[PDB]
């Protein structure tokens, strides 16, 4: 483990950044996504029956 | 009356048919062999479809309309009321575009250039041909053919379409609209790259090639050069219409359903036709 | 037969080319890209380097956002199964909301919510690219004639998925992302309007786009023709006009009895391809606010035959 | 040494910046996630 | 608004294409205009301004300031072709061919034209020369098929003119612009690229004889190629193929 | 933590601060539109129905 | 708060001004459509019911 | 110093320019806000 | 067996490491998408059922 | 030492500076938040 | 407000002009036709029913 | 000696951290198997 | 076999490798998708009866 | 001499060391295919 930091020599800590940065953006969104698609944990719907906000 | 450089390219020759019989010019169309044909063919379907109009009826320019032969005369001759005068401007078209095509090379040849031009143009007659001979005669009826009329030909476009469903799932036609779409987006693109080196901001010098290069590069990470834009801009255009000849050629020939049955073949592949969901599951 | 020069027959290369500086910010450009032997064949083989500023981080990542929302709807229409997302991909539609809603904002995100979230992130990517085409032109100190050529284009896709709608009163009526559903959207819309081939703006919108492919066949095949003279490098011939150029007007004034110069014909280039989404904008703005029937209308207007 | 053109005490240096900022986004995202669990159990 | 006539028919669909047609006129009219930049105004054939110069008049004058100090262009402005031209006429009418009073490759008339241009080389975007022969470029190299180099260049007469010595290659687009053949008698010629056919055992010149290379007009100095010499070199490459004996 | 502020050192905070807006702007407004399109949270629709002005 | 000046030694004035003079126009445009699409918020139509100018 | 060639000096002063401005268009905005809220709650 | 640190003489680690993350990430989506399309693996219509999340 | 060529000082106050909006932009957040859960709870 | 005169510093007046100029009319067109499109407003209608010219 | 220029110095040192990587990554992929195998067996 | 070695005399090692690797996973996957598409040795179908978690 | 300037002894090392990557390879598939074998024969 302890040598891992010369992963810094080989990649450029900006291109990485950036690609990171990226790439957890769209999982996180994506997951989000998936969860408001899915009626037994979209948090909205789920207070909204809670609540009895709706109808 | 000659432009101001033009007189040192006048010269005898070139000619493919008539020697010096016909080599001249007539203000600033050169003449030639094919020339004379050119227009004898041009002058007679223009003023056979006046005629036909004379017969039709109507003097209003976008009425007028010469129908081809009904499919009961299948690939015989008509009466000329009756689809006949269709034939003999059919015909008369087919010449001329071919003269005009001829006649292009025979100037090509006098001032030296490359073929390219009237190579370009039997694309085009090639594709009209397609579809007023080589699609009628394997149909088996002139009356498959287009009526030459400045909205009834639409009519023909319109009818022709619909007898297969929606016209946009021809697969062959989705390609050729591909290409016309890019054909338009990279002349627009070329006309302004040229346009905007040439005519830079007030007051500033031309800008070269490189900043040609420089400004497609930055803007898109690719320049394709200058010759090869203009590679480009011909393979483009003469897709476009090889697949359009080639999406009606096949169009009742060997295809004959709703166009729109056909991607069901995808669809229906064996290792998927079969998974619930989606859209066709 | 002899070289026709539509393939190049022998590539060199050497080193790669950085662009002019000007008055741009060389920070901003990457590194120099591969070079692709492929490409070289037909134009230049050097890849990149490109420019990545402000804006063009705005327009990537909105549009990034775009085709990634309508990615995950796709995900989603396919029960998340790669097998169906692949089989079902020309047949899934992101869909605006349905009539009911207007223009409102209150429609469930499967009843075109969605739509809305991902139609803005794509105005959002258009814009700041139109920004981005004015602003690369104006660090190289060029003319601006590709930002506003870009602005037709953005014309008719503004009519078809903003103003159209606004002025009908619903986004319904804007176009679904889908591969199959925008051409059914097509021809849905001639349908509902009547016969489009008889709006005279789609008419003329297809004599500009035969007229693009007409006019760049022309002029591919006319410089390809005179390559052998130097004319492809046009803009030395517009400032110091040589045998290529003179070449080539005569052939079109011999043939057609008129001729363009090197600049004047991207004059014609330019028009000809701006014209169609020029008038193709107009032609559908008018569709439904102005004339719901195109083939009645055409008969009023002395173009089609009386019933 | 290098690709980047860092030295081992800069790539060292970074390093440990770098894992200080995932240990702490991963915190986050235990503590989020043992919070959903709570809440929601997913098993 | 359907139905929405201000008189008769005049809708507002009406109003657009009406105005459409008045903007494609003044459209059409601006283009050919700009189009009248060179070339204009009109000759006779004794080369005195002809009676005759047609609907539209000549555009204002428009100044390009060249770069790298070339000066300016401005446009239209007196033309001349500052040459002699080797052609008389064939008949006292207008509208027949000048026949070649000489040789019409030496001349360089006819498909063997050739434009007085700027006897200077054509520059980059930096300032130096664009086309350089590859062995003075710095990095180049030939990277991708055969190598035309070493190759003996064969006439359409089916005889061996020479052999290529040089690729001569347009430094920013990085593409091979002529071949430079050595003669038989040891001195060299540009030929365009464009104008030679290359295959694995020669280099093939559709539009020359054997015979014709000699005359291939020379560059004046070895190392680069002005404008005007690649004219009188390219123009009559390309007369050979009208005036190269069977 | 203390030393994250050599972050500047390695990115030009011109383009982080861009990147940045660019960011926090797209996401503010996802969240807003997520919110108008669920009956339950758009206040607009709750508003009409709490005042009686849905008519 | 005191040190924000500093970002003007960042960026360009005329760059941000310009691009702040964009975006607070297309989000006012924004929210005025928002309210005029809304039925419970347009204001033209809520005067033509209280002033009873229609119909 | 910095990126623009503006003094700290000159971006001093053109921040009080340009906050006064943003104090003027968000207190007209308030009072906007305050109208419509007088006359159509929402919330 | 061991010499095979020497397949770094060979692939520039640059690349190697590019295609690798690439590549393990579109595999573990690819294998989470397949047990998400599949009903007897999909993690969060098994916990509905388990915990009576709908009806 | 670095790409950007700022100085350590330099590093040191921008992040200073930067971190005073963040905490700033977060802190209306949270107030955002509270009041929307105050009204109308999601959980 | 008294040093806003330094816009003219930043700003060419002439590009401001213009677009200023364009702007105004854009909106000032927008809003009319908003108005003669609505049926309470629009005031050619408006006096046709006042002056009862309808018929 | 390589086409990377790597020596086998280097090519050895790289190597045995990238192998440390993949036995601690397949280490949390076992843990992962065997948790999932235990909540709901495949085979 | 003793002088197989000679073939990395004709082939570049790092051209082999690459096609060699893509090779066998497409090979891989191959197979494993046909037995997926097998209802006899699709595991995950196997495990559903085999525990009857579906229905 | 040869078309990757490899010599003789530099195509026996690298040789050696491939085969013990098939060997490892094939040998982690025998396994895979005897166990797959004693769970669900297909002979
Ligand atoms: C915004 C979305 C909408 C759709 C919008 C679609 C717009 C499409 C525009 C495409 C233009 C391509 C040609 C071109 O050269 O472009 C570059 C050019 C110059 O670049 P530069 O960097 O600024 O300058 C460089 C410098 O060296 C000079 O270069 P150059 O010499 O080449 O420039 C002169 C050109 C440019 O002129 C124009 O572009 C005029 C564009 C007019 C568009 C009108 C279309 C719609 C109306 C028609 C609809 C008709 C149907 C309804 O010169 C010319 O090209 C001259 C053309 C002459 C045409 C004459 C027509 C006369 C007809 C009337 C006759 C009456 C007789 C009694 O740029 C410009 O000059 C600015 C262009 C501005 C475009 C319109 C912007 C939107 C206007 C409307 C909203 C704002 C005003 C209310
Ligand atoms: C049954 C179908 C109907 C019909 C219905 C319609 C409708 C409906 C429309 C047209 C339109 C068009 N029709 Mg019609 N049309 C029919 C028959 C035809 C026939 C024929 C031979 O029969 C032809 C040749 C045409 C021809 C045409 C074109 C002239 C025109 C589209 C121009 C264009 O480029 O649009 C394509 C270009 C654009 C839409 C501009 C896009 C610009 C934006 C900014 C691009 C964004 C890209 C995005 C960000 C993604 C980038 C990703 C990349 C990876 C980077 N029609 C029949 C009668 N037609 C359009 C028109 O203008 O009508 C007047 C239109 O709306
Ligand atoms: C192949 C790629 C594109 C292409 C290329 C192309 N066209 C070309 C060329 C090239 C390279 C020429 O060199 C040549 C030319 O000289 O251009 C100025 C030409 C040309 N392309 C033309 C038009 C044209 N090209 C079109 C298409 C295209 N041309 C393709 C998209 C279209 C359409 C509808 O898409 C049209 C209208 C002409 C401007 C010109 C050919 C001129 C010619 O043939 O002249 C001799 C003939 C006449 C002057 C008139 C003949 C009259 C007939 C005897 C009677 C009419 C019969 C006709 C069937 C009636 C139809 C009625 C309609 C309402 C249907
Ligand atoms: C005058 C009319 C013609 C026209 C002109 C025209 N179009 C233009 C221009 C011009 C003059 C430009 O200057 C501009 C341009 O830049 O051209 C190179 C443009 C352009 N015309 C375009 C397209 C286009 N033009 C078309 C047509 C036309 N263009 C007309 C024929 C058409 C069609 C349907 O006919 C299309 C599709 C674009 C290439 C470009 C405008 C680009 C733009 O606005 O992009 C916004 C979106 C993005 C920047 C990115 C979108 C998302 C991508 C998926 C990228 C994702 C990147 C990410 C890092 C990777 C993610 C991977 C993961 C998801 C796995
Ligand atoms: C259709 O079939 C399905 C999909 C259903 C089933 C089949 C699936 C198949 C065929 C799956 C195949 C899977 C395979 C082939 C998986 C392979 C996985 C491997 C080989 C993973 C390797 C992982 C390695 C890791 C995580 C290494 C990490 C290393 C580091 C973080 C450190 C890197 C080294 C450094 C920093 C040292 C630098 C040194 C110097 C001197 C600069
Ligand atoms: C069901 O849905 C699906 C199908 C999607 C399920 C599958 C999900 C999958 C496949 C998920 C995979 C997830 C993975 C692979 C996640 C990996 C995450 C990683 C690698 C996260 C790393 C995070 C690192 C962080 C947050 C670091 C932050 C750093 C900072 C805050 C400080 C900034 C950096 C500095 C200061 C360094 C510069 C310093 C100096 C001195 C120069
Ligand atoms: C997918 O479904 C949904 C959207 C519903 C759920 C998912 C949501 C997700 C994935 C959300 C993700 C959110 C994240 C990651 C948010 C992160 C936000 C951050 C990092 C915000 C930071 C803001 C910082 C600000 C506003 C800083 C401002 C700084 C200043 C005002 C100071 C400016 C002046 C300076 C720097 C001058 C100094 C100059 C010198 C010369 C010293
Ligand atoms: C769908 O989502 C909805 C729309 C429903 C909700 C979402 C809403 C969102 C995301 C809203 C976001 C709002 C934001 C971020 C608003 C930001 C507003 C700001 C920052 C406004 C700033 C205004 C500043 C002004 C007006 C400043 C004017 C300054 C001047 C006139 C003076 C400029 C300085 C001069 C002339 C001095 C020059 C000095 C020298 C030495 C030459
Ligand atoms: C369904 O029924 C169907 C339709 C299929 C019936 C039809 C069947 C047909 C038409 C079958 C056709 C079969 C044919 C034509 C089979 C041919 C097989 C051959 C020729 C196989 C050859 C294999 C050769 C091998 C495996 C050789 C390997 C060699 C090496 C590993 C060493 C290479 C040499 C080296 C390294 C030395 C290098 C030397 C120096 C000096 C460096
Ligand atoms: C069609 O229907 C189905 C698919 C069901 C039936 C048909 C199946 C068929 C036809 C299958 C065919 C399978 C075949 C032909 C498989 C062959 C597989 C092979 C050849 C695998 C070899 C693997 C080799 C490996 C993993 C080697 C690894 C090597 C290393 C780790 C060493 C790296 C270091 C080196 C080489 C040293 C470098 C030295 C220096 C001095 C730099
Ligand atoms: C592999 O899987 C992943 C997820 C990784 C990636 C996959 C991505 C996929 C499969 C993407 C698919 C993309 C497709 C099929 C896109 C199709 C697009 C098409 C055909 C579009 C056609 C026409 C669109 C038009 C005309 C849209 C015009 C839109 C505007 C003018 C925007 C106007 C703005 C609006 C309505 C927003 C108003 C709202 C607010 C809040 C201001
Ligand atoms: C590029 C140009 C494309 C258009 C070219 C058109 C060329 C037309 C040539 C026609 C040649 C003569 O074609 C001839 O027509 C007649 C009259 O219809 C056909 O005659 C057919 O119809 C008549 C009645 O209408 C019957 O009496 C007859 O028994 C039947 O065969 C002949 O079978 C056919 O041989
Ligand atoms: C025939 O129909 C086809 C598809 O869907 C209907 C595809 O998705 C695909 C795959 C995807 C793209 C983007 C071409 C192909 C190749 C295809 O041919
Ligand atoms: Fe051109």
Redesign the pocket.
Same mark, same amino acid.
């Given at each position: 483990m302890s040598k891992f930091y010369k992963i810094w020599m080989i990649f450029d800590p900006r291109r990485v950044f950036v690609a990171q940065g990226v790439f957890l953006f769209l999982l996180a969104v994506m997951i989000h996504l998936i969860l408001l698609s899915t009626p037994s944990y979209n948090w909205l719907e789920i207070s909204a029956a809670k609540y009895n906000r709706v109808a | 009356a000659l432009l101001s450089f033009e007189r040192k390219y006048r010269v005898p020759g070139g000619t493919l048919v008539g020697g010096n019989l016909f080599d001249f010019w007539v203000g600033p169309f050169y003449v030639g062999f094919f020339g004379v044909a050119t227009f004898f063919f041009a002058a007679l379907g223009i003023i056979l479809i006046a005629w036909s109009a004379v017969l039709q009826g109507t003097w209003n320019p976008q009425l007028i309309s010469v129908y081809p032969p009904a499919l009961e005369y299948g690939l015989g001759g008509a009466p000329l009321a009756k689809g006949g005068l269709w034939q003999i401007i059919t015909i008369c078209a087919t010449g001329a575009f071919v003269s005009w095509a001829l006649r292009e090379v025979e100037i090509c040849r006098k001032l030296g250039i490359g073929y390219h031009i009237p190579f370009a143009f039997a694309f085009a007659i090639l594709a009209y041909l397609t579809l007023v001979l080589f699609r009628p005669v394997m149909m088996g009826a002139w009356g498959y053919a287009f009526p030459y009329g400045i909205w009834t030909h639409l009519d023909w476009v319109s009818n022709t379409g619909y007898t297969y469903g929606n016209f946009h799932y021809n697969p062959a036609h989705m390609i050729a609209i591909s290409f016309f779409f890019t054909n338009a987006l990279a002349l627009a693109l070329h006309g302004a790259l040229v346009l905007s080196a040439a005519n830079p901001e007030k007051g500033k010098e031309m800008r070269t090639p490189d900043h040609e290069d420089t400004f497609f590069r930055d803007l898109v990470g690719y320049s394709i050069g200058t010759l090869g834009i203009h590679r480009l801009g011909l393979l483009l255009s003469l897709s476009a219409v090889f697949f359009s000849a080639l999406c009606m050629i096949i169009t009742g020939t060997i295809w004959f359903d709703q166009w729109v049955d056909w991607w069901q073949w995808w669809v229906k592949l064996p290792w998927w036709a079969n998974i619930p969901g989606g859209i066709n599951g | 037969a002899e070289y026709q020069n539509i393939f190049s027959q022998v590539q060199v290369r050497g080193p790669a080319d950085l662009g002019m500086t000007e008055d741009v910010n060389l920070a901003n450009r990457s590194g120099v890209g591969p070079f692709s032997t492929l490409l070289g064949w037909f134009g230049n083989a050097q890849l990149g380097p490109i420019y990545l500023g402000s804006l063009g981080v705005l327009s990537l990542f909105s549009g990034l956002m775009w085709? #990634?929302t +309508? %990615? +995950?709807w796709?995900?989603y229409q396919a029960g998340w199964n790669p097998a169906v997302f692949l089989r079902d991909?020309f047949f899934?539609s992101l869909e605006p909301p349905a009539p009911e809603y207007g223009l409102s #904002?209150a429609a469930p995100l499967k009843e075109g919510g969605l739509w /809305?979230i991902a139609? #803005?992130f $794509? #105005?959002v990517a258009?814009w700041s690219w139109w920004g981005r085409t004015y602003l690369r032109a104006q660090a190289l100190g060029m003319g601006k004639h590709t930002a506003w050529a870009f602005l037709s284009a953005i014309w008719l896709? $503004?009519v /078809? %998925?903003?103003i159209r709608?606004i002025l009908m009163g619903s986004?319904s009526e804007?176009?679904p992302? %889908?591969?199959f559903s925008?051409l059914d959207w097509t021809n849905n819309f001639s349908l509902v309007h009547g016969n489009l081939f008889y709006n005279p703006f789609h008419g003329l919108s297809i004599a500009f786009l035969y007229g693009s492919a007409l006019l760049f066949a022309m002029h591919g095949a006319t410089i390809l023709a005179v390559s052998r003279f130097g004319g492809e490098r046009e803009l030395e011939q517009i400032a110091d006009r040589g045998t290529a150029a003179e070449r080539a007007a005569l052939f079109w004034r011999w043939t057609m009895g008129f001729n363009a110069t090197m600049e004047g014909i991207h004059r014609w280039a330019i028009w000809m391809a701006v014209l169609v989404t020029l008038t193709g904008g107009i032609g559908i703005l008018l569709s439904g606010t102005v004339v719901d029937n195109w083939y009645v209308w055409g008969q009023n207007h002395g173009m089609a035959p009386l019933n | 040494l290098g690709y980047t053109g860092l030295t081992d005490e800069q790539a060292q240096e970074l390093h440990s910046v770098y894992m200080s900022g995932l240990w702490l986004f991963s915190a986050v995202a235990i503590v989020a996630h043992l919070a959903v669990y709570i809440w929601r159990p997913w098993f | 608004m359907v139905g929405v006539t201000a008189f008769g028919n005049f809708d507002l669909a009406s109003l657009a294409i009406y105005s459409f047609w008045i903007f494609l006129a003044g459209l059409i009219y601006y283009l050919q205009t700009e189009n009248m930049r060179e070339g204009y105004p009109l000759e006779n054939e004794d080369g005195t301004p002809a009676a005759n110069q047609g609907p539209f008049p000549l555009p204002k004058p428009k100044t390009f300031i060249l770069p790298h100090g070339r000066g300016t262009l401005t446009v239209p402005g007196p033309e001349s072709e500052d040459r002699p031209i080797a052609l008389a006429r064939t008949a006292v009418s207008e509208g027949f061919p000048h026949a070649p009073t000489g040789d019409p490759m030496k001349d360089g008339v006819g498909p063997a034209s050739w434009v007085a241009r700027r006897d200077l080389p054509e520059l980059d975007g930096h300032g130096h020369n664009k086309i350089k022969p590859m062995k003075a470029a710095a990095g180049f190299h030939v990277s991708a098929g055969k190598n035309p180099i070493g190759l003996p260049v064969r006439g359409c007469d089916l005889e061996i003119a020479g052999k290529v010595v040089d690729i001569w290659v347009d430094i920013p687009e990085q593409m091979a612009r002529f071949l430079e053949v050595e003669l038989k008698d040891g001195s060299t010629r540009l030929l365009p690229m464009q104008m030679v056919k290359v295959q694995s055992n020669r280099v093939h010149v559709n539009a020359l004889s054997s015979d014709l290379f000699a005359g291939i007009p020379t560059i004046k100095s070895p190392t680069e190629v002005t404008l005007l010499e690649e004219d009188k070199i390219c123009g009559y490459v390309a007369g050979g193929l009208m005036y190269a004996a069977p």
């Open positions: - | - | 085709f #990634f +309508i %990615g +995950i796709f995900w991909l899934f #904002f /809305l139609s #803005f $794509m #105005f258009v896709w $503004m /078809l %998925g903003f709608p986004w804007a176009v992302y %889908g591969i925008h | - | -």
